[PDB]
Design a protein around this ligand. Structure first.
Ligand SMILES: [Cl-]
Length: 994
């Protein structure tokens, strides 16, 4: 579009500018809020511009009967001048015990400098009115929501930018021989730690975890990543050498302050009991504190991509720091307010940028040192003294140097820069029209792009690795993508440079023994971090406002505010938790319910290992809390619904039950937060996916469930039609007693049989499978229809909300680990008003058989869960025939050498009245294909190679009693993913009566 050839560096600097320009300025946020409120106050104040009216305090007062306050003053005796907005930020109300007194020692005026302040230049507003008005505003929660929206809109931008800062900084420093080849390869190997050769830790001092640094370490090398430094990679032979280097660095007072900037403002101040980061650094330098308090906790980082970890911890720090900055800013440093921009601005490129009239960070007073960036020039340099002198309030409230000067200035310059760059390079270019040229350019062809897979190229321009894939949702359209910091997420890239285009996301799903690449979103159940099988009592996908019946925002939800969702347990009140922990001898074994916002991978580790920090390791020696301890790292949970809402937005919410003996707030300087050792055992009560992955454009449940039951009692199979799959791993006895059989290659001899009712108390070892998930699941179970589907059902949608009431009985019949299960039902034994529903679950290649012989109905499910190839089309058929012959009182008949699905059709036609077979055929597995047909056998292939998008099958039967006659109806169907919305829709059905 523009004159210049767009380049990777240019697009990087544009993203950097965008991150800084989008950042919420405290001054602007508060001013907009105050104008909004002023438009509806009483007295009405929509005339008052709070950035151009001045709260001025004086030490000399003189009575004036015509001025609005009743007093006039002389500028000579002005002690504090602020705009109304500044006066709101610095909590001016704290200067006055009775607000009504501020009317005599202060005034609101239309100008900030004048010989005499009086009725000639006053504003018609009392200082007391404004103080009362301020008391009714919570500015901390306002800036918290502003930061929440900022992160909702820029979290991926920040993550990708940070990753590219790391990669580009490493390459550039290696080409300048500032790091050896080994060091460059080490740094790159540490991003994903693919071969598991490296150990990655948060950088801590006395258990205080840095917000944006980390350590990568193996026997060969130790590395500290410290963003913003002139060389972000500090290498050492071992941890002792690294400690010595760090102590030497921070032995200079200024270097030490800059280093401490990598920790939250809370972690830097001393607590009631334990010292903070600043004291600990000072005393390490003086030598009173051993250097082994550097890297003392050794908290492991659990996310695959280290930049996910760094981004999440930077976001958390920004919430904490905004809190402090708005609430208490009296007698602080001038660069205080800049903490919330510390890390983002640390992503200035080390490779220097040249573009006409673009402001480079060092021309903005932002220098760099060996331990990170510095604002000393911007804040105190004589270059900017003129601009600062112009601004009111900076004289008496140091924090305003950041709030009124520095942040607005940097934001305006970043807006300038992004306009300049857009005018200089135009717009984007990706695989369009352009496939032929690109493919001839990299000596490739369509066949080279693996059908089911990807192809890695290196772009001739920047030598950026890129990945070609054929999109399954858009009929094979080829695209070029690159992996994000989030698992299963990719971004299309610029074909010339390789820079990621965060607008265009591609999702990598694994399902049906295939790899799908889709644009709209993934299949819940095929992502790398599948929750469905962790025995979590409550797991669901949170719906944003725009996906609900009721304001149409798509990056937030009312899951927790105003009314916490009824599905979720309510947390223990802070007062109860503090009472319990303070009387520890009495409530040591009692439990509280706590919340936390986490990444997908932290949530998965917590739900998997059932520990506070998702730690694999063991914990106790009759553990006893005692504050920080060498090599003991902590997770942090919360009791505030507001905090959990803000932290889990666009990520995951976790709710746990934990014993009081593991929790501690002794060294927590803010409210409603509790530390728990990472290895501490917990009970995971709930996990909510609040990522809001959706494309861009209760009486009801009881009544509906009753209607479903009334339809089922009538014999209308249509009540199970179109509503998705349903299963459940919950065991409840049902009234029906039936013959059950199991045939598994785990038991090569004999077919196990069971003729006792499935009792609630106990599973049956033969109708179980220790390999399904966290601790196995039942392959045959019975329950009642008050919960038709639970968290274990992959792809359930309708039966997660509605049901068929407690008067329906569900028989879930799955396949054995390497074999078949089966049930035989006496048809005369079903009773009116007690209908029976048989469900097969989510079909991914298994085979289901419904059949009738006399007054008996047989249902058999064969397959394997060990990902075996060839088993289900042959050996599974053998197990199914063994089960069918056992249940039908039959010695196995003649069977050929090649037993395949065709001989299943033949055997069912021979030894049964009528039958339905629902199976998964593929021309690449010839045994699975059915080329024969028999009248009394109906066939339904719920999967084929034709199906482009992810899919699954279902097969169900209803047994209903009416007029001393038992009606039996079976319905098989196959669902396929709707390309445009990533939701399952019915694709095929076959219905057969019995
Ligand atoms: Cl990639």
């Amino acid at each position: 579009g523009g004159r210049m050839k767009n380049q990777w560096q240019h697009q990087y600097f544009l993203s950097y500018s965008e991150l800084v320009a989008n950042f919420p300025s405290p001054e602007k946020v508060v001013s907009d809020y105050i104008k909004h409120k002023f438009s509806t106050t009483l007295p009405w104040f929509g005339w008052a511009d709070p950035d151009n009216l001045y709260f001025i305090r004086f030490t000399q007062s003189r009575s004036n009967n015509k001025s609005y306050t009743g007093w006039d003053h002389l500028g000579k005796y002005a002690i504090e001048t602020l705009t109304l907005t500044q006066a709101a930020i610095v909590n001016i109300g704290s200067r006055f015990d009775i607000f009504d007194e501020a009317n005599s020692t202060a005034g609101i005026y239309k100008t900030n400098n004048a010989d005499s302040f009086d009725e000639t230049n006053e504003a018609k507003m009392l200082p007391s009115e404004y103080l009362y008005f301020l008391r009714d505003c919570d500015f901390s929660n306002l800036y918290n929501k502003a930061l929440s929206d900022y992160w909702a809109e820029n979290y991926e931008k920040f993550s990708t930018l940070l990753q590219n800062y790391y990669i580009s900084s490493a390459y550039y420093l290696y080409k300048d021989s500032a790091i050896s080849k080994d060091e460059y390869e080490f740094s790159i190997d540490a991003i994903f730690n693919k071969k598991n050769k490296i150990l990655r830790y948060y950088f801590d001092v006395y258990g205080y975890y840095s917000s944006d640094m980390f350590v990568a370490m193996n026997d060969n090398k130790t590395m500290l990543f410290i963003p913003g430094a002139t060389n972000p990679f500090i290498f050492a032979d071992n941890i002792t050498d690294l400690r010595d280097k760090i102590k030497a660095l921070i032995s200079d007072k200024n270097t030490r302050e800059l280093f401490s900037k990598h920790f939250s403002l809370y972690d830097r101040q001393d607590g009631n009991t334990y010292l903070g980061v600043n004291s600990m650094l000072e005393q390490i330098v003086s030598g009173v504190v051993d250097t082994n308090y550097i890297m003392y906790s050794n908290k492991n980082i659990r996310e695959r991509n280290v930049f996910e970890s760094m981004a999440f911890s930077t976001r958390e720090r920004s919430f904490n720091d905004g809190d402090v900055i708005i609430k208490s800013n009296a007698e602080v440093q001038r660069d205080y307010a800049l903490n919330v921009l510390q890390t983002i601005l640390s992503l200035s490129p080390i490779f220097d940028i040249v573009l006409p009239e673009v402001s480079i960070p060092i021309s903005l007073g932002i220098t760099a040192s060996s331990v990170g960036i510095s604002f000393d020039e911007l804040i105190n340099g004589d270059t900017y003294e003129e601009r600062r002198s112009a601004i009111p309030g900076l004289a008496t409230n140091a924090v305003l140097l950041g709030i009124s000067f520095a942040i607005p200035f940097l934001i305006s310059k970043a807006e300038e820069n992004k306009l300049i760059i857009n005018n200089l390079v135009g717009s984007d270019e990706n695989i369009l029209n352009n496939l032929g040229d690109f493919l001839e350019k990299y000596n490739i062809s369509e066949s080279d792009i693996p059908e089911n897979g990807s192809l890695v190229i290196n772009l001739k321009n920047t030598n950026v690795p890129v990945r070609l894939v054929k999109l399954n949702d858009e009929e094979g359209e080829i695209v070029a993508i690159k992996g994000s910091t989030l698992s299963g997420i990719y971004y299309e890239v610029d074909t010339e440079t390789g820079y990621e285009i965060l607008s265009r996301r591609v999702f990598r799903t694994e399902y049906n023994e295939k790899i799908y690449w889709t644009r709209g979103g993934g299949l819940k159940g095929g992502q790398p971090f599948n929750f469905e099988g962790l025995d979590i009592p409550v797991y669901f996908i949170d719906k944003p406002y725009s996906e609900l019946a009721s304001s149409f925002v798509n990056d937030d939800s009312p899951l927790l505010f105003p009314e916490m969702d009824s599905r979720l347990p309510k947390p223990t009140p802070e007062l109860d938790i503090k009472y319990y922990s303070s009387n520890l001898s009495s409530f040591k074994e009692d439990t509280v319910i706590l919340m936390r916002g986490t990444t997908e991978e932290e949530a998965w580790n917590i739900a998997n290992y059932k520990t506070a920090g998702g730690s694999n390791k063991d914990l106790e020696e009759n553990f006893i809390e005692a504050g920080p301890q060498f090599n003991l790292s902590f997770s942090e949970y919360t009791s505030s619904i507001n905090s959990a809402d803000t932290a889990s937005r666009k990520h995951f919410l976790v709710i746990i039950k934990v014993q009081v003996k593991y929790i501690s707030n002794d060294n927590v300087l803010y409210a409603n937060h509790w530390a728990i050792p990472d290895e501490a055992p917990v009970e995971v009560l709930a996990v909510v996916d609040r990522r809001f992955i959706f494309p861009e454009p209760t009486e009801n449940v009881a009544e509906i469930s009753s209607i479903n039951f009334r339809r089922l009692n009538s014999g209308n199979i249509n009540v199970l039609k179109g509503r998705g799959v349903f299963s459940s791993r919950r065991l409840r006895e049902i009234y029906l007693r039936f013959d059950a059989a199991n045939a598994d290659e785990l038991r090569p001899g004999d077919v196990y049989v069971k003729k006792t009712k499935f009792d609630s108390m106990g599973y049956d070892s033969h109708f179980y499978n220790e390999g399904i998930g966290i601790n196995g699941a039942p392959t045959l179970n019975t329950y009642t229809g008050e919960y038709v589907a639970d968290s274990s059902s992959q792809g359930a949608t309708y039966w997660l909300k509605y049901n068929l009431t407690n008067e329906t009985s569900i028989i879930k019949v799955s396949n054995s680990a390497r074999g078949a299960n089966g049930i035989k039902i006496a048809l005369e034994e079903i009773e009116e008003n007690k209908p029976v529903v048989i469900t097969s679950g989510t079909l991914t290649g298994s085979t289901v058989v419904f059949a009738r012989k006399g007054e008996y109905f047989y249902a058999v499910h064969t397959g394997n869960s060990e990902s075996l190839i060839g088993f289900t089309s042959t050996s599974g058929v053998a197990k199914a025939i063994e089960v069918l012959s056992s249940l039908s009182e039959l010695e196995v008949p003649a069977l050929p050498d090649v037993i395949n699905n065709n001989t299943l059709v033949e055997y069912l036609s021979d030894n049964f009245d009528s039958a339905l077979i629902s199976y998964s055929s593929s021309s690449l597995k010839p045994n699975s294909m059915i080329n024969i047909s028999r009248e009394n056998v109906s066939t339904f292939s719920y999967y084929t190679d034709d199906i482009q998008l992810p899919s699954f099958g279902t097969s169900v039967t209803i047994l209903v009693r009416t007029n001393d006659n038992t009606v039996v109806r079976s319905l098989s169907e196959s669902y396929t993913m709707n390309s445009n919305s990533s939701k399952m829709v019915v694709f095929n059905v076959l219905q057969k009566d019995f």
